[model samples]
Target: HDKWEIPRSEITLERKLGSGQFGEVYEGKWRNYNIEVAVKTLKEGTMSVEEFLQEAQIMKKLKHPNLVQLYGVCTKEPPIYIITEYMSHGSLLDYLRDCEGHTVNAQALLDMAAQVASGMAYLESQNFIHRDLAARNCLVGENNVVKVADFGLARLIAKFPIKWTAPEAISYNRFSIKSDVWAFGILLWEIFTYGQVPYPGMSGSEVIEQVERGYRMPRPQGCPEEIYELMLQCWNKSPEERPTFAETLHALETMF
Candidate 1:
């Protein structure tokens, strides 16, 4: 195991970075970079090898300050290794999860939200639409730096949603720059609410139905009214009505 793979024992697993519905993650290092890469090892089922390579390809070509940098890869077959910029803190979802009941300062929230918007803004400028802009997909690094990660679920803004999707997106099955605006609003809500579990009782379908019927999720109790208003604008069913990421950044900057 030379440069292709680092010895798992020597690098040291500092902590568990939580897992997905199908994968697990660990915090570790490579040289002095301070890495926190997620390893999706093949466990029970099968993962298409070709799709994995495609994901790597997408990551390598993406070069944005707000997005995570893909250093290289260690594809020794299944359980492919992806070397990426280490987020010392972990994902925004995990950060919020562990900070329940604590009030996040307004300035900090604004800064973090602005950073995320900047990243999305970069993606928008590049002509690549990120279908999923949730908090869990956002990584938190040192000094409250936020970088949007996880492009595996993304595509070139398809024309139809084959799986469950946000109401506006399902009807069109198309992901556009606007759909991302809507998702960013939800991401903002999630950041302020400590990842409050996205409605304890509502199923994905139920959430979609309610959104389609003109009702949107209410802002969390402690969220600033101005921020909530901005988020509401983003979640508007009419994608055309949502504010551009640059506009959102300006508004947040004013708040800050």
Candidate 2:
């Protein structure tokens, strides 16, 4: 991983892409690699600097076409930053919301979600658990390629969505690949609805109580029943009954 390192001078910090709990992420260029890149700037006064350093270690280990990559880090100085891939289009939620319906058809939605599952499947292979899985957490490449992202240092920032949380996750504070599958179902529903918020107009405790009783969002308009059925499997009240990301990928493969 030594070759992953690049001098700070080698990276030209471009305009700010956006900012959140994860800190300021900038679109930039790697001079030596001659490639566009993203720099995740870490601020000095976070409670858990060690959390990200440990998480950065996780980012370095996991690599896949559908996962945003960490090339190296800049930790010599105060603002520790990580050089990562630049996803041109931003979050899948943004793309789903901003694009025209005709432009982003049902097939396109399926493709993006499947690619996300592809990444999750790889992570599952590595026995890595994605505590948070949602449309907003994933990013899009230039060619409609979607990469599962925001896994790095995200837990440190926490952030939760109740409607997307599985029953076990909501009840017992449990997180497993199965719980991830549960969120993936919600993400699929988000895709079919062009990134609409799950359980529209429902409060967190309301959604929580309803979900525990086996209430599920109805199949969305424009979503194929076949895919809706797949989300159902993901939403099984029992985590053990939910499909694995690998099995989920297989189901998606059969659909196309």
Candidate 3:
């Protein structure tokens, strides 16, 4: 109903941020809009142009400070582009690793997690389910603002993000805000552990077995006791028992 098609000639690709299943994301410019954006290139591995535009239409309506803005899309050619708000700092995982013990303090770490929670709380209210939520899916914009990126547009991940997935989603395909809560717990752990892989040295099968047996990751050294408690709450095996993103965000903010 609305025009969201960005002219290919109007976009100028500058730097390659990273690669995807079929193409890569670039730090680019939208000439007409006169703003910087991260342009995501796609080659239709499993996503078609029709679906791309469908997703874009939905994405454009969602506006929030902590969620990446969907600037526009280019859908005429084979390899389409999804232009989004550019985060000067890339993936939260890489940012945390790059700053490992260099200068990250306790409050700063918790604050980042809270930002993710704030964005997630909005999604929950909108009844939008985020099938994937992890440190890698999170981006850091200017002023250390963390926005939840990749709003389920690319479901072409070759290897399912198993480690970051909730058990119910893996076993029964039951995805919901509660499932997101479980993944949120994993993201919080990633935040405290400087973006190290979740579950340390376990494989997906082992993780499943252990998780069914009530196993949960121990707290990262010096993680606030309150934060650790919230992580546990987020991991409740029954989705009905997990805290809503709003409750999670409130808990995180009050803990500070």
Candidate 4:
């Protein structure tokens, strides 16, 4: 039985968010909480029902306001559903684009970045590592306050592939907390650029190579040089060289 067991008639699915090799996401509403959730239905060849639900169960245990709330999930096999809080402003990428176009308030940018940094810090404290942390996973709210989402790929840092993950995830799959710091830095770059895609000419494979070789996406226009430099530090090849989340969050707090 679905965890949300509420009849489908009670809720309405809104617009599509985006989709990747995994699945698609959609905005939606239930009762009156004002939600835009991503429903990740399992692909046919993906992991079994037990594995998917086990991951979903882990998500259910994570609680933090800065992190997108997991309202509920449907444990059905082929169509496992992840019901999360709907972010009004959409992905951080959307807001970044608007910022680059010069249509968004500057304070909004600071707040969004700060919120995301803080959220990731909280996750690190809990020992959870978000394997994929980028603009797409940073959900935005009405005030541009941010919340980190997409735990579908999250795992405890001690996991193996997690260590050898994209250089972005450096530090043995033990996935030192610094991996999140690196991603947060990349995310900052995305915010400053206003939704510009990363590594223009590189494929995912090539991008990883560049990152492994100590390369990162270029700085976004209009970003403060100090912040850009800090982002650069966070993306350093030596995972240990990265700043702690506490340090990153403190720096972000000072920006406001």
Candidate 5:
């Protein structure tokens, strides 16, 4: 893994990008590569070095156009940084929010969803589960390409947005591909609605209450019935009933 390690002095932090439960992400330059990258660093003591390195190990092995690419890490000392390709368009939620007044055609919307499903399909094949899957956790790259990101960091967080979490995850802290599928359903809801809040007008507690009681959010205004049915299938009470990421991707492709 030494090949995946980087020296601290070589990276130049440019701007603050965002913060998660365990670290802050910044736009930086990897001097050796002479390319812009997103640098994610965990503050000392927030998590053990071993725990931090495990995430890097998982990322270093993953490579797909739909998945964020990890270039390397700086793990020799404090503030370990994990470098990844910088996405100019930022988070999918923000991207959709920016298009609030604009008209996004059906094909464009389905394409974005397909890209995310494609990334998750790769993770499923690798036996990795993105405990947190949502529009906010996905980054939009050039040409509106959606790439699944923040997978490992999201798992490290003590608390997560309850709305995006599946019942199994909330009840038993059980994270699996099926649970991720549940979140994808909610993410689809986010995408079709142009980043509208899920379970609108409800508190986190209420969302859990209703979801456990078999309540599903109504299809977003103007969302196609076929896609909404897929979302419903994903939110099935039995995880076994939900479609796999590969299946989901196929469904989206067929629609397009």
Candidate 6:
């Protein structure tokens, strides 16, 4: 009963959106549905067929208001395509960068963070670990709603953005709900700073060393103490010490 299989002829790739470790993403149309979609494909020899199929299967089961919707897959060829709902507004990182030097109200920021937390809370309940969670991995849709995207990293199985990753994840290649929670805190830092780069001027090795040594970034200017405190909790050196996504979502909800 795999209703998520799509025919290859139905997809009309319009333009290349961007390239990543996985492969190139394209702006495309699903002819049957007559709607836009983001087509994620595997670059030749970059990923195995089984890995691609696994990603499609994982996405097919996950559906949430704050998560990118998986339409179907075009898997009849070497470069398999994963079709998903297109976010007209693009990634949260780009969105915030566009708003640089502009005044974004506190409520709006909180709403975006809450949306992400809500999405992660759902994933947590399902026992999915989003190994890569950050502003760049989040997409902004209509009305400024943020939906988590780029599950390819976690599903495809992998980081230059080591700053957002948990210490255990970096050290022992371990990833779980707590690791994602750690990354979420870094996402909060990005949101509060309007997409400022984490650990400014620090390299990957430096970040690992600093974090292992119990160093955490100072609060972003204009970030309230309450929010910063939550971020600090997520950065706790021990994974067991971090709050769950449900708990984090509850804390954020209370702030509204």
Q: Which is the leading candidate under lDDT? A: 6
Worst 10 residues of 2 by lDDT: 151-160
TM-score of 6: 0.92
Tens digits of lDDT, candidate 2, 130-206: 78788888898878888988775333115567877888888887778888899899999988888888898988888
Query: Scored by CA lDDT, what does every candidate get?
Result: 0.70, 0.82, 0.82, 0.68, 0.85, 0.85
C-alpha lDDT of residue 76 in model 2: 65
Instruction: List TM-score per model, in order.
Output: 0.82, 0.92, 0.92, 0.79, 0.91, 0.92
Residue by residue across 121-197, what tens digits does model 5's lDDT show?
A: 88888888778788888998778888998766433215677988888788887777898899999999988988888
Worst 10 residues of 4 by lDDT: 157-166
Q: Assess candidate 5 and give its TM-score to the true structure.
A: 0.91
Per-residue lDDT of candidate 3, residues 1-256 (tens digit): 2488777899998888786776688899888878899888876786666655555665776889999999888876768888888998888998998844226888999888889999988888887877778888899878899999876542211236778777887777767788889999999888888878888888888998888778899888878899999999999988899999998998988866
lDDT string for model 6 (92-127, tens) is 988888843136888888988999999999998887
Instruction: Summarize candidate 4's per-residue lDDT along 68-126 as a digit string, tens digits.
Output: 77777665434656676667777777766654324765566667788887888887788
lDDT value, residue 152 of candidate 4: 58
Candidate 1 structure quality by residue, lDDT tens digits, 1-256: 3343544443444556655544455655665456556544333254565655455567766888789887656565445555567777667888777742135676777788888999888777777777867887888777778899877766553443322245667776656888888878778887788766565588766776777888777778978899989978987878787888878878888864
- Model 4 ranges off by over 4 Å: 1-22, 31-38, 43-46, 76-78, 98-102, 157-174, 203-211, 216-218
Number of backbone clashes in candidate 1: 3
* Rank ordering of all candidates by TM-score, starting from the highest: 2, 6, 3, 5, 1, 4
Backbone clash pairs for candidate 3 read none
What number of backbone clashes does candidate 5 have, counting pairs of residues 3 or more apart or in separate chains? 0
Task: Show the colliding residue pairs in model 1.
Answer: 159-173, 160-173, 161-173
Q: Output the better candidate (1/4) by lDDT.
A: 1
Q: How many pairs of residues collide in each model? A: 3, 0, 0, 5, 0, 0
Q: In model 2, which residue pairs have backbone atoms overlapping below 3 Å?
A: none
